[PDB]
């Protein structure tokens, strides 16, 4: 039992909880983000996660081959998932690049973000303690913006390529390449430390956050709903898609992981434990993040909703401030960023391993014919590094925000989840799926899972998509920069690169099948033996 929970401990915490959830919650007003979050959690997140693990165990193959055994017509779901993984692996590692840069900057007598007395610093800076005495800027925020990021005025100005961040990305990609090639993973005595360090660090950060003299206001802003005016399609999409992104579902990695699983240790129970604890760690770290934000609000004399960036930089603004107020701040900064690097590196290794496995399973005749697998891994790493170079430039923050919002999140995850649930519930058959689950694990899913797949998840996804289309608002970096029309088109192209996989595969298999149209569709709907 303890060993199983330890093996779980590798995968039920990640950057999606520590970093993504707090900034999405902050961007959507805080408390109002929680209601759709929990609604989607219990409506689809656990049922869809369980459904994908069931698919993976039932087929015992990749996320693309399983649909052949379920529904040949909708085999495009696996392709959409593999492109989602490919797009995610390009922009997810930029977080590790920023963490590596911060870790290298932490090897100093004094943390550079503690005070603003350097060459890269604006003359409008004022210390937070002395701020409550104009358009002043906190040293941490402008450090993040100018030294680590060197933020451009807009996406239309790429600027110069930051050599230091490029070397950080190169280092992280080489680490990933060597780990994948040599099969390096936490399996010996080191798994104890690898699993336990993140939660010890999160506990220390949370304790520091609560004991701040202004944590109460931050907690109140974190938990107080705003149903009067914050009910917008953006909050619904963000909360629903965060559930899918945190669990790594709709990506097809869960299917490949289930393939490895031989049988059921109450797979239902394992999925529920995974989901409950994965959501719990996010909700718990929200307290730490928002307590830090509330203390900064109390110290700087500004509103909680305006203290820090409403974007991916919230984790790189709030946490350094928290570690700045601990005894020997350099020590805790080093430990925090090492923890962040390990948490991101483990999930990066998992994702690149899954992507490589799926891509070689697509073409085993040449890719897997021999030692060319290592060359393929090197090729994938090189192309991903070159693609990530676009987000290293001075205007790379906007590209990163667009990629996060569209490429591996947003409408694409809703599309994939809706098609999976619709296929299994209606085309393949909910009764047949329950029969398969009985044969596998010994008991049927129950009314909750069956009704969720049949109605709740498709209705939620369709309603969110339609609500977004009717009440469409353009994506904005932070809360003041408006993206150009071409940037929005590029983001929608990134989303469509995954969304269009299902219709394209459908028409391709319809054309590549003999017989009349009805015979074609009948042959492609019937599951294979």
């Amino acid at each position: 039992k303890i060993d199983f929970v330890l093996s779980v401990a590798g995968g039920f915490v990640g950057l999606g909880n520590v970093w993504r959830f707090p900034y999405l919650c902050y961007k959507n007003g805080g408390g109002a983000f929680l209601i759709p979050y929990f609604i989607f959690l219990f409506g689809s997140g656990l049922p869809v996660f369980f459904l994908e693990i069931i698919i993976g165990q039932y087929t015992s193959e990749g996320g693309i081959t399983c649909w052949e055994k379920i529904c040949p017509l909708f085999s495009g779901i696996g392709y959409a998932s593999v492109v989602i993984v490919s797009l995610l692996n390009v922009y997810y590692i930029v977080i590790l690049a920023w963490a590596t840069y911060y870790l290298f900057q932490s090897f100093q007598k004094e943390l550079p973000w503690a005070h603003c007395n350097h060459s890269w610093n604006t003359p409008h800076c004022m210390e937070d303690t002395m701020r409550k005495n104009t358009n002043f800027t906190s040293p941490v925020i402008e450090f993040w913006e100018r030294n680590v990021l060197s933020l451009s005025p807009g996406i239309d100005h790429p600027g110069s390529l930051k050599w230091d961040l490029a070397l950080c990305l190169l280092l992280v990609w080489l680490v990933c390449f060597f780990c994948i090639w040599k099969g390096v993973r936490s399996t010996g005595k080191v798994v104890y430390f690898t699993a336990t360090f993140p939660f010890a660090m999160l506990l220390v950060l949370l304790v520091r956050g609560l004991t701040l003299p202004g944590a109460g206001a931050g907690i109140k802003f974190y938990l107080y709903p705003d149903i009067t005016r914050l009910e917008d399609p953006q909050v619904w999409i963000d909360a629903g898609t965060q559930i899918f992104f945190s669990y790594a579902i709709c990506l097809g990695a869960m299917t490949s992981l289930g393939s490895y699983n031989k049988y059921h240790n109450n797979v239902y129970r394992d999925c529920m434990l995974l989901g409950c604890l994965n959501s719990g760690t996010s909700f718990v770290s929200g307290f730490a993040i928002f307590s830090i934000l509330g203390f900064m609000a109390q110290e700087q004399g500004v509103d909680i909703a305006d203290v820090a960036e409403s974007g991916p930089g919230l984790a790189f603004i709030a946490y350094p401030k928290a570690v700045t107020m601990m005894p020997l701040p350099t020590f805790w900064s080093i430990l925090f960023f090492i923890m962040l690097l390990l948490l991101g590196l483990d999930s990066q290794f998992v994702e690149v391993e899954g992507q490589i496995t799926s891509l070689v399973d697509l073409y085993p005749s040449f890719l897997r014919k021999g030692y060319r697998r290592e060359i393929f891994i090197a090729f994938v790493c090189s192309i991903s590094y070159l693609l990530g170079l676009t987000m290293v430039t001075e205007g790379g923050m906007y590209v990163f925000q667009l990629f996060d919002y569209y490429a591996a999140s947003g409408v694409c995850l809703l599309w994939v989840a809706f098609f999976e649930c619709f296929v299994i519930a209606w085309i393949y058959g909910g009764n047949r799926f329950s029969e398969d689950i009985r044969d596998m694990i010994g008991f049927p899913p129950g009314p909750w899972m069956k009704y969720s797949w049949a109605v709740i998840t498709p209705v939620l996804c369709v309603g969110c998509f339609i609500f977004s289309l009717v009440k469409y608002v353009p994506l904005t970096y932070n809360k003041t920069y408006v993206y150009p029309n071409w940037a929005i088109g590029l983001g929608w192209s990134l989303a469509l690169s995954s969304m269009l996989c299902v219709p394209l595969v459908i028409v391709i298999r319809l054309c590549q099948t003999e017989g009349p149209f009805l015979v074609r569709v009948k042959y492609l709907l019937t599951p294979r033996e």
Partner: antibody, heavy 118, light 107 residues
């Protein structure tokens, strides 16, 4: 579930054939799996075969893997067991049981009918 | 086939005294995949305990079960006159399904 009743038992000869039936009522027959359990005159229980809720997966015991055939009629809510090459050791009482949940076991058992191969 | 054997085939018993009977399995059986059935004389067997700890609807709290891995047992706190019946252990972890030898309580 309330009632499970078997029927069709009787006297046969070695090498003969017989079809056993199990009518079900009080529950949705199509949504619960069914199994046959055999009680020898020495009072020993032996499992015969299991059929899933939809009948897609079918399991047999080693002694009857190639001799007996199990079938169900979801529309009629009735369970059938077919015997082709009944031997001298097959004389016993057969009960049809509900085994939908493998972690819960056979919730209900039928009255059962005796089979003899004298 | 996973053969299950129950040692005390015949047990003479008097009212009030506690009685425990054990089931032995030749292969690893999961805790949730072992169940016991009670069969009165001249009657079909009825489920008594499932998952080695959960009591059926009809069985009173008088009965309880324990065991894991390869040895299982269920005990009676104080046997009554109505407790005289045959109990069989069954494994549901893997096919073919097998039942124990069975202990017929002799009053």
């Amino acid at each position: 579930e309330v009632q499970l009743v078997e029927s069709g038992g009787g006297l046969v000869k070695p090498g003969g054939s017989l079809k056993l039936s199990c009518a079900a009522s009080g529950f949705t027959f199509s949504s619960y799996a069914m199994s046959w359990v055999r009680q020898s005159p020495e009072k020993r229980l032996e499992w015969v075969a299991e059929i899933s809720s939809g009948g897609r997966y079918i399991y047999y015991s080693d002694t009857v893997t190639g001799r007996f055939t199990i079938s169900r009629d979801n529309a009629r809510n009735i369970l059938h067991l077919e015997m082709s090459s009944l031997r001298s050791e097959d004389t016993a009482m057969y009960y049809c049981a509900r085994g939908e949940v493998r972690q819960r076991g056979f919730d209900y058992w039928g009255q059962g009918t005796t089979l003899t191969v004298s | 086939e996973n053969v299950l054997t129950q040692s005390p085939a015949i047990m003479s018993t008097s009212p009030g005294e506690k009685v425990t009977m054990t089931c032995r399995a030749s292969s690893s059986v999961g805790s949730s995949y072992l169940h016991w059935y009670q069969q009165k004389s001249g009657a079909s067997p009825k489920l008594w305990i499932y998952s080695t700890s959960n009591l059926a609807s009809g069985v009173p709290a008088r009965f309880s079960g324990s065991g894991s891995g390869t040895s299982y047992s269920l005990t009676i706190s104080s046997v009554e006159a109505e407790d005289a019946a045959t109990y069989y252990c069954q494994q549901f972890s893997g096919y073919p399904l097998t039942f124990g030898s069975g202990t017929k309580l002799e009053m």
